[PDB]
Amino acid sequence: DCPQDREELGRNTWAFLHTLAAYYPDMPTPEQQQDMAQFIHIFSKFYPCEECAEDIRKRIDRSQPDTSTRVSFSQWLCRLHNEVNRKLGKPDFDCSRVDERWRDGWKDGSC
Amino acid sequence: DCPQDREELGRNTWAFLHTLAAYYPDMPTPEQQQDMAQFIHIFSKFYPCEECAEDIRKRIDRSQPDTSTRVSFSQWLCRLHNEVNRKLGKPDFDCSRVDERWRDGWKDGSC
Ligand SMILES: Cc1cc2nc3c(=O)[nH]c(=O)nc-3n(C[C@H](O)[C@H](O)[C@H](O)COP(=O)(O)OP(=O)(O)OC[C@H]3O[C@@H](n4cnc5c(N)ncnc54)[C@H](O)[C@@H]3O)c2cc1C
Ligand SMILES: Cc1cc2nc3c(=O)[nH]c(=O)nc-3n(C[C@H](O)[C@H](O)[C@H](O)COP(=O)(O)OP(=O)(O)OC[C@H]3O[C@@H](n4cnc5c(N)ncnc54)[C@H](O)[C@@H]3O)c2cc1C
Ligand SMILES: [Cl-]
Numbered sequence: 161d162c163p164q165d166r167e168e169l170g171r172n173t174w175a176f177l178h179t180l181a182a183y184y185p186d187m188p189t190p191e192q193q194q195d196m197a198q199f200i201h202i203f204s205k206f207y208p209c210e211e212c213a214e215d216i217r218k219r220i221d222r223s224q225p226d227t228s229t230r231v232s233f234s235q236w237l238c239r240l241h242n243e244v245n246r247k248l249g250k251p252d253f254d255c256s257r258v259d260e261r262w263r264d265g266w267k268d269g270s271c
Numbered sequence: 272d273c274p275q276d277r278e279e280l281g282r283n284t285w286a287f288l289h290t291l292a293a294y295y296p297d298m299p300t301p302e303q304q305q306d307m308a309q310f311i312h313i314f315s316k317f318y319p320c321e322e323c324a325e326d327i328r329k330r331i332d333r334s335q336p337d338t339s340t341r342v343s344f345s346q347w348l349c350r351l352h353n354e355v356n357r358k359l360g361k362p363d364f365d366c367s368r369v370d371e372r373w374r375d376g377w378k379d380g381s382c
């Protein structure tokens with residue numbers, strides 16, 4: 161029950177974000193497409209990451225969040241997460257398995 | 272390595288939000304204040320737990336977040352979380368310990 165260090169807050173935040181995207185509507189209205197985009201932009205301005213190698217502010221303004229659909233948003237967030245993985249020497253996550261991981265459970269039934 | 276259940280998603284999101292508030296500026300600009308207000312508003316529309324989001328939307332529309340300062344916002348978020356605690360039968364968190372819990376660590380160097 162101590163303050164989150166970078167690693168712990170990261171783990172909290174990916175879990176929240178990927179779950180957010182997993183339950184985002186398959187067919188979002190324009191207003192929802194715009195709320196989610198805006199949400200991700202505001203997130204980029206406030207996420208605590210002092211002296212982080214990933215400049216997420218700049219990253220979110222260059223490769224803008226694609227909030228057209230659940231799968232678009234899901235895949236965009238997965239690519240973002242993989243950019244952070246690369247800088248940190250963590251292996252690439254296979255983005256095609258994003259639903260198994262965060263919504264449905266691995267096909268092997270272990271969830 | 273499996274999808275978040277309601278309890279897991281919850282633990283991660285609070286950690287993320289209290290930490291977000293803990294690193295919010297002491298004297299934020301009018302634009303930061305408005306951004307954070309909007310962030311929370313959109314959050315309440317999209318939080319993946321359906322029952323949970325309808326619940327917090329109605330609590331947030333009742334008392335909008337005070338994003339005036341790190342203190343106001345952190346405390347506001349503490350009070351919001353204590354409402355969910357009460358509904359769920361969990362103990363009250365002493366909001367005077369919030370800075371210690373999510374920012375500075377316990378005054379006794381326990382962290
Ligand atoms: C926006 C953001 C920026 C960050 N920037 C930095 C930084 O610059 N420097 C730094 O040191 N730390 C940064 N962090 C924290 C860091 O990314 C990790 O969270 C932390 O290092 C813990 O790593 P981990 O090995 O526990 O797994 P995490 O990266 O936290 O991943 C947790 C789980 O998500 C799943 N996962 C992994 N990759 C993907 C993917 N591509 N798509 C979907 N699911 C995936 C895996 O199952 C993994 O176990 C950042 C975190 C966030 C949210
Ligand atoms: C916005 C939101 C709405 C939710 N709505 C529901 C719902 O309607 N129904 C439901 O069943 N679950 C809901 N949840 C999930 C639920 O609140 C808990 O997260 C979950 O039950 C796990 O609780 P926990 O005992 O592990 O501790 P959590 O409540 O998840 O808290 C995690 C840690 O935060 C610290 N903490 C506790 N209270 C405070 C506080 N008030 N201020 C600062 N720090 C604190 C404590 O150290 C605690 O160990 C919601 C979660 C969120 C984020
Ligand atoms: Cl509009």
Ligand SMILES: [Cl-]
Binds near residue numbers: 191
């Ligand atoms: Cl809107």
Ligand SMILES: [Cl-]
Binds near residue numbers: 201202204205
């Ligand atoms: Cl922005």
Ligand SMILES: [Cl-]
């Ligand atoms: Cl901006």
Ligand SMILES: [Cl-]
Binds near residue numbers: 205217
């Ligand atoms: Cl910006």
Ligand SMILES: [Cl-]
Binds near residue numbers: 221
């Ligand atoms: Cl911008």
Ligand SMILES: [Cl-]
Binds near residue numbers: 175279283
């Ligand atoms: Cl977890």
